[PDB]
Amino acid sequence: AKLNLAVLNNVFSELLTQEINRSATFLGLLSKYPERKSNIQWGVGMGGT
Amino acid sequence: AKLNLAVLNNVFSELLTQEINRSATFLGLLSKYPERKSNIQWGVGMGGT
């Protein structure tokens, strides 16, 4: 018959461990640009002469 | 009939040599901590978003 076997409390501690891998490497070097249009159009030149 | 044949002192020497391996290598570098609690509780964060 313990006098504090039901009053002692369970407290965690500030030790959150980052376990999941959410990395972004190839997104991090593509030299981003703000295109506010409907579709990107440029010109490709083949031969023929 | 010899004079000092019965009266002999068998004195030892200062040559105690220990032949045991009481080494603590992996224990001696763990950066020991004191704690006063029932059990350590921390939080491991997984993914899910």
Side-chain angles (χ1 to χ4, degrees):
Chain A
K2 182 69 65 65
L3 75 159
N4 55 9
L5 191 60
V7 188
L8 84 174
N9 50 10
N10 293 318
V11 175
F12 286 91
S13 63
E14 185 182 359
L15 212 281
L16 187 66
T17 64
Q18 185 180 3
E19 188 71 26
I20 195 67
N21 190 3
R22 47 184 60 185
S23 67
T25 67
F26 182 64
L27 185 64
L29 73 162
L30 287 177
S31 69
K32 277 75 68 179
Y33 291 107
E35 185 69 26
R36 55 181 69 187
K37 290 185 181 180
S38 296
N39 45 8
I40 302 101
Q41 293 175 356
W42 69 95
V44 174
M46 298 297 172
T49 59
Chain B
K2 184 70 170 64
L3 298 172
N4 48 9
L5 177 144
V7 182
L8 272 307
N9 45 2
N10 48 2
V11 59
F12 283 90
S13 62
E14 293 184 355
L15 207 276
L16 194 146
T17 59
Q18 193 69 38
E19 290 187 354
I20 204 67
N21 193 2
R22 296 178 185 174
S23 68
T25 62
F26 176 64
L27 179 62
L29 80 173
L30 289 177
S31 71
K32 280 82 71 176
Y33 295 108
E35 65 96 20
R36 292 177 293 271
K37 203 177 287 184
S38 297
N39 44 7
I40 306 102
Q41 298 179 0
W42 73 95
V44 174
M46 296 296 172
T49 63

